[PDB]
A paper describes a structure:
The ring is opened either by separase, which cleaves Scc1 during anaphase, or by a releasing activity involving Wapl, Scc3, and Pds5, which bind to Scc1 and open its interface with Smc3. We present crystal structures of Pds5 from the yeast L. thermotolerans in the presence and absence of the conserved Scc1 region that interacts with Pds5. Thus, Pds5 can be considered the gatekeeper of the cohesin ring.
The region within kleisin Scc1 of cohesin that binds Pds5 has been mapped previously (Chan et al., 2013), and we therefore synthesized a 23-amino-acid-long peptide from L. thermotolerans Scc1 (121–143) containing this region. Although binding was weak (Chan et al., 2013), molecular replacement and a difference Fourier map with data collected from co-crystals of LtPds5 containing the LtScc1 peptide revealed clear difference density. The hook opens and the entire structure bends such that the most N-terminal part (left, top) moves by up to 10 Å relative to the central part (superposition based on Cα atoms of residues 473 to 726). The nose becomes disordered in the co-crystals. In the complex, Scc1 is in a mostly extended conformation, except toward its C terminus, which forms a more compact arrangement with helical turns.
Author numbering: 125 to 141
The structure:
């Protein structure tokens, strides 16, 4: 968990950022 990066975007905002 500490070595892995989680997410930080939803599913409606993926490549729209």
């Amino acid at each position: 968990s500490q070595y892995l990066l989680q997410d930080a975007v939803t599913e409606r905002e993926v490549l729209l950022v």
